Amino acid sequence: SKPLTTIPPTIVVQRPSQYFNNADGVDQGLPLSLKYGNEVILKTPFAGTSSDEMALE
Amino acid sequence: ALTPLVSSSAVVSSTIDVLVEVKASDDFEVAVPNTPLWLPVDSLTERP
Amino acid sequence: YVLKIPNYFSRFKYSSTSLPKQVLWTSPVHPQIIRNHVTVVDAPGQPTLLAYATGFFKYWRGGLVYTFRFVKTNYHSGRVQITFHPFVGYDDVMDSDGKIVRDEYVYRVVVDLR
Amino acid sequence: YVLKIPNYFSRFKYSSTSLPKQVLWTSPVHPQIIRNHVTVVDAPGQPTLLAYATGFFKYWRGGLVYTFRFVKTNYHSGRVQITFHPFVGYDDVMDSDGKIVRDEYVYRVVVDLRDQTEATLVVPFTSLTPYKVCADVFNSANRPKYNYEPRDFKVYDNTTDQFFTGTLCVSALTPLVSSSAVVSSTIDVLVEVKASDDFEVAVPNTPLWLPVDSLTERP
Amino acid sequence: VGFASAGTRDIRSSYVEGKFIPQDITGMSRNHELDEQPSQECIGERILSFSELIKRNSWRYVSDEKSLIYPAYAFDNPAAMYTAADKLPVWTLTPRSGFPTLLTSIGAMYAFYRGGIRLKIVPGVADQPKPLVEVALFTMQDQGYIIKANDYSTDFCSSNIYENFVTKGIAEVQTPYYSRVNTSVVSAPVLYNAGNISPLMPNVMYKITSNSSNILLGHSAADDFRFGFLLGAPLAISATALRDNFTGSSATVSLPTFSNFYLS
Amino acid sequence: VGFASAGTRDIRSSYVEGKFIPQDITGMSRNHELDEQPSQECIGERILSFSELIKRNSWRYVSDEKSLIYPAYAFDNPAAMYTAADKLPVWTLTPRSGFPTLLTSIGAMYAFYRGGIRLKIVPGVADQPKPLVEVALFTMQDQGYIIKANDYSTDFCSSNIYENFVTKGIAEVQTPYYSRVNTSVVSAPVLYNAGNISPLMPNVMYKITSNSSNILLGHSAADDFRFGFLLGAPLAISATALRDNFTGSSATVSLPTFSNFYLS
Amino acid sequence: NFVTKGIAEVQTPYYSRVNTSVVSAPVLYNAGNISPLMPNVMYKITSNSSNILL
Amino acid sequence: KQMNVNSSQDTTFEQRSQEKVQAGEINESIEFRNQITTFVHDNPIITEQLIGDSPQPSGDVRSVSDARTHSIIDFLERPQFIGSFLWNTSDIENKEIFSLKLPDALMSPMIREKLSGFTSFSASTVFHIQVNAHPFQCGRLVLAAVPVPDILPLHRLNMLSFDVSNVITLPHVQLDISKETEVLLKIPYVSPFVQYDLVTKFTPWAAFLAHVYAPLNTPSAASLQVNVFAHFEDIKLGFPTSAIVAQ
Amino acid sequence: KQMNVNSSQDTTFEQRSQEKVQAGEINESIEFRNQITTFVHDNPIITEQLIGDSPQPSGDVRSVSDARTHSIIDFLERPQFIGSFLWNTSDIENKEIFSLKLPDALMSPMIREKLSGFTSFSASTVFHIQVNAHPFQCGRLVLAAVPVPDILPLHRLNMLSFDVSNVITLPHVQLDISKETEVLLKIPYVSPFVQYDLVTKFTPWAAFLAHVYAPLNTPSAASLQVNVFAHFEDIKLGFPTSAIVAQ
Structure with a gap:
């Protein structure tokens, strides 16, 4: 069967780069890896420490 | 060679061929698929 | 499956003329093992299955299996040694006389052929 | 439902004149069974319901049911055989004398006609490929010229x-005998075809047949 | 079951209803028993009804009017002429409401129908400054159920839908059955006097307006549509043979297809 | 397990099936036992099958026709010529159906395939007034399974998809296997007489139409696609060597890539 | 698409031959694109815009 | 019916059990099947035999019958000596000792006689290559299989003739004449066609080839015969037809 | 051994289990049978196949294979149209419509192709004589069987040609063209030879004959075709041989 849609409309917001300047949010970039979800693990220790060398503290 | 390959020349050739084959082991792995090194062609001839 | 298919890629000779410690054959350990195009003389050549298949990727790692088939009779007799020299190219496994050097330092298989 | 409707598509004769082993009729087994346009002489012709309906698909497979209606009296007597010859065209089921050949090798129904008047059987799908193509007309000319005609399954x-x-065939085992003092010596035999339970069509795309409200000769 | 009989046994309804079951020439019914493997391995789908096919859209007519009155439920097909006479085009087609579509081609096998239909419109030009298309239900009792350029300037308060050729590109409409009866007649006759009140078809037409100089119209069955009372094969000609040119005159027949329409 | 034997022991299937297990030269199997740390720390993924790679799209052919008939399931690769003679271009490629893609390059290692494929189209020009692209299933039995400009004006009621080069930019299509058999032949031979009915490939092609003067076509395997019966390395040349110009003639070989296509 | 969206957004995997790269490693003439000090991967960017800001 | 009838049906009252037929005709008639022929009789028949008829007792034939039985499948499974090919010291790496198409190479009169009457057949195939070298000779052969040889792309067939490396990647088995006496390769039936077309011969599903892997190596010129035995297995037959098994 | 081996035996140590042989030779070797050929190997062998080898699945062939199966016995049991013989109003009592030797009359190419490879065979035989007269014609035929026709005393064969009374005493069945549509006679295999010699053809075990019992009786001259269908049953095959099935 091919019924008529009954889903109601959704208002949308066109955006060139959402979260461009944010530390957080969800990036919308297109990945260049073969697996879309490619990601490397968080290595600990790294560079000789188990400490977080990027923390302001 | 640790020694020469010896044999009686009255009955066998004094030189033999040794063939070598290679293949991947269990842990073989490849990564970063992108522009291939080899391009398949349907024929390859000398251009006149 | 694909990378475990056998790739015949080289051959050499062994004879009554070979000398003790004489290097009979060498090969760099990597997967871009190539063959010659028969109808044309380009330098790059023709890839083996292993080179063609791994050629779709820029990186590789892992063990490589080598099989040596000695085409002989039961009346040929000799001992040969198969050695692995990590971090050395083929000009450096031999001295100026084509004799292998520093073989006490490497993994080695002494094969008795009868 | 649609493909199981009967399609009258052919007829032949059987008489006191028919000879033993004489092929009386043949037909290629497929669904693009066509008829003639009456008001116009185009080569492609008019499709039967079966050809029109299956014509909306490029592929077909399945059994075809054939019914033979022998229009006779109880005073006509003869035996005929219905045979299925997979993988052979109609020129090859007969020899140069119009006699059937190699009939020991095929599925065959020997029909005794005295009181009996009808025979129905299913010809099962027999193919090296799961699907066959619904035959379109072919170009009898050489491009860039086009003259489309129906395909001829002689081979x-x-x-x-x-x-x-392949080919479905009816051949006489004996002449159809009868008393000429009371009955006609020649009878008509009608043939109908329709789909079996497993008939199936696939790949619907450009139809083979285009419906028109009228068809006349252009002056 | 028996290959032969004295008297008629293979009766039209008995076979379709499964009461008469013919025997396989091989004697093993398994030889004509359904096998699902082929469709699952080779095709990827299995079509069971023409009900499925008519829900697929196909092109019906090309209009060169910016505002048009179009006979929505008219399912007639073109008149055709054939000739093998020298230098004359072999085939010629003369449409009334349009060319054949899956909807009208399948429909030509039946006498009746009921239910709604769908309309699709491709623009010859998507005019940026005036990109809208309006499809309106047209009900004037006076209008003949035929194609006609819109000359009405008083059809206020109609049921209208708007689609945008620039932001979307193709207009999509669904038309309710809106019939005075529960059984309509496929390709019912339309007459001079007639107007738009005959009970043989829904008394409803389309009024299509846009700023595109040309549009390509297509249709299909809506989800509640059905054809009824099978008649048989309709009068038809080979579609492939329309390329015939053996008379020396080049073929001039051209069906409304996207490629024919979009390029000149 | 033992480094040597009297008689053949390393048998093709026994090794791949894990029945023959060669010994590590060091005697410690741990030295060639899988380590997952490298891929997790350095790569971010771990590819296990060519099945994954062929699902990635790559460019196959550039057309200069606005309406084209294209051989969907033709997986042939170009003919190549080489020379080191003075002033002649070192390498020359002559395509039939197109240039090599991941689909056809991986496919060249096998004899058979089954399943559907996907098509991607990049427009040379996204024409605002006529922005649509149509990709239609093409089934005429008469057509040779080769690339040809569309001359047909009678292929009504085809299966069509429409994409918009202006609102989207790239056309995306999925093609069902639609085969008469369950095992097709990679790069089966296409002949003069042939037409579009050979059982060696799905009897289906594409008819592509748009108002862009040029288009770039690409493809990949659909989710139900598979290659079967490994043969080995196909005849091949070094892709990097195509830049060779040592004969004094400048390299003229150019593969269909987006940058080559979009800029002149 | 610069017209329907306006800004291109990409994510690049580490794709490195080692697990520790060197910030501003030295690039040389001979070098090429195989040094272990950085992922052996670069970008090829193409559009019909005469200028772009990365 | 001791007429070894596969099935029998008196149809005299059949017309009386049709739902849409009323007062159906009672017509003496009988239908019976014998293998692929069905006799549809439209009147009484008489079936006679010898008084006290008894088929020939089985024990009577022990003097000539084989205790083993033989059907069509059994015949197709019989090993056949397919050919004897020359291999000599002058042949170099990859020289082709033979290339045999399937079925073709096994279509001897014995096989053709038994396949006659069928549209087609499919089967796995087992090939044996045998070489009898004496102990002072050495060398090596490869027996490989390639699918649908007549429709494979030319580049592939050429690759096989250019370099034995492309033969070694195929399904294959190697023969060391100083170690093994014979070597076997079994290949299942694989093709776009579900069975091989005996009528049009359209397309041999595979070819077995034997190439020199390492040359016959002896002190002076010599030659050996490379023999081939083959037989079918996992046999599947087609449909009864009058079509000729093509030459 | 997935090489569909009928039997297999590693014989390496066989010489070590002979009672009168002491310190027997240990000799690597293996013997295996495939249908009628046994391979006796005198060294190691390698048996290879495709990686993960799987024979063609049965479902793949339903599009062409017959759900019914066909063996050699099945083929020999197929009804065959043996001949169409003329019978007309001028033929008098005892006129011979036909006389067909067994097997001879059934040795069509289909039967010969399937018997090829056997020394001989024996079988019961069923003959059908069919006549299609219209209701206003009357007459009567006798279908009879006589054993070992080529070696029977001449007086007996003559008696059959002299008087239909000597045909009626034989195993036989009668056909009344106004009452029965067809008539069948089944004869078991009976002969001094336990099976029929396909090689030397020495001696057909029987002959079926049809003679006019009462003439075709119609108001004006007429003729009818007397048709014969036949097939074998209770089939017993001989022994595998290379001898030719004689023409």
């Missing part, structure tokens, strides 16, 4: 085998 080879499974 089963690589230029025809993608469309049909």
